[PDB]
Design a protein around this ligand. Structure first.
Ligand SMILES: CC(C)c1nnc2ccc(-c3ocnc3-c3ccc(F)cc3)cn12
Length: 351
């Protein structure tokens, strides 16, 4: 019942994978990590196979490995990247070193489809509907994406969409400095560490994506953190007395107060000629105070999506046990937990 594995070198690594996966070919030019498109002969799908780099290099990497595998195993929703397969060539814990993860190969990201382009109003509707449908599922598991942006949205030829890279630490270290897209979708409370934030950060990111799909333009392309914040307050107004109380960082509060106050702008004059229902939705997403943003479950019931909305086809998730997050473990302990999670994996049904 353990498959037969075969070896090859791909992008200077030895990849050892079950024979069911044929014709492995690097994709994304390193942008997604060590990932190969392959043909899965068992399901007949084109799949993306990721070989984790340095999975057990430090306590921090070990845990990051475990976390990503936990997150992927839990997700079973059409608009969320999940696991078709997870394997290692190792036959015991003692020889366990590498982890390979397998999911559907969508083929492109939103970003590398829609660069510089206003999309038709039904393409916007359909794409945002799907982001919000996947997001309602993710949030119902108490998972926060934290890094939603076009590059993290994997889209296929039929404009079907799956959300990538949710709930990871990873986005931390790579650069958020200067004129960089890694920062343009971030909610201001997380960009400037205003407070203990939560899942509402992601609705901000949805707003920013939706605007950009409408206009063809990045909504807040700041040259840095401070220039971006000025872009943001110009549109959505400076914080009022109520939000200021909630900015638990005295440092941030004190800098915000130094800015000339500005009223919210009129979204109908900003998004000239766009569906009024779209405007109204963006107004509900791009609210400076996170507590007041629309939720994904609520946005799905908004009239903009009336063509796609179906409350019996917008599932929620099983509860996700993230107690491990507060556990203080050694490398070998995270590695063994990870091993158990590999070994116990159950394939989805092939129809
Ligand atoms: C072209 C590109 C955007 C793309 N298309 N489909 C996909 C699918 C996945 C990934 C991916 O990006 C970063 N990590 C992964 C990943 C995650 C889990 C897994 F099992 C295998 C790979 C990229 N994809």
């Amino acid at each position: 019942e353990r498959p037969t594995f075969y070896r090859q070198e791909l992008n200077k690594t030895i990849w050892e994978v079950p024979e069911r996966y044929q014709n492995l070919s690097p994709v994304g030019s390193g942008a997604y990590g060590s990932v190969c498109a392959a043909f899965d002969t068992k399901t007949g799908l084109r799949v993306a196979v990721k070989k984790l780099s340095r999975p057990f290099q430090s306590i921090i990497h070990a845990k990051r490995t475990y976390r990503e595998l936990r997150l992927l195993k839990h997700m079973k929703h059409e608009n969320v990247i999940g696991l078709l397969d997870v394997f290692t060539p190792a036959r015991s814990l003692e020889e366990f070193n590498d982890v390979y993860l397998v999911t559907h190969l969508m083929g492109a990201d939103l970003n590398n489809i829609v660069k510089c382009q206003k999309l038709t109003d039904d393409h916007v509707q359909f794409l945002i509907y799907q982001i919000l449908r996947g997001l309602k599922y993710i949030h119902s598991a108490d998972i926060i994406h934290r890094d939603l942006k076009p590059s993290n949205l994997a889209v296929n030829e039929d404009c079907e969409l799956k959300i990538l890279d949710f709930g990871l630490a990873r986005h931390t270290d790579d650069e958020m400095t200067g004129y960089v897209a890694t920062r343009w979708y971030r909610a201001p409370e997380i960009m400037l560490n205003w407070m203990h934030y939560n899942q509402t950060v992601d609705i901000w990111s949805v707003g920013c994506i939706m605007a950009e799909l409408l206009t063809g333009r990045t909504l807040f392309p700041g040259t840095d953190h401070i220039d971006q914040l000025k872009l943001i307050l110009r549109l959505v107004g400076t914080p009022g007395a109520e939000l200021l109380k909630k900015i638990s960082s005295e440092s941030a509060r004190n800098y915000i107060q130094s800015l000339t106050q500005m009223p919210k702008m009129n979204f109908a004059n900003v998004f000239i000629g766009a569906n009024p229902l779209a405007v109204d939705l963006l107004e509900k997403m791009l609210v400076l105070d996170s507590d007041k943003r629309i939720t994904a479950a609520q946005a799905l019931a908004h009239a903009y999506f009336a063509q796609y909305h179906d409350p019996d086809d917008e599932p929620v998730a099983d509860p996700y046990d993230q107690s491990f997050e507060s556990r203080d473990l050694l490398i070998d302990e995270w590695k063994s937990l990870t091993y158990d999670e590999v070994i116990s994996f159950v394939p989805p049904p092939l129809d």
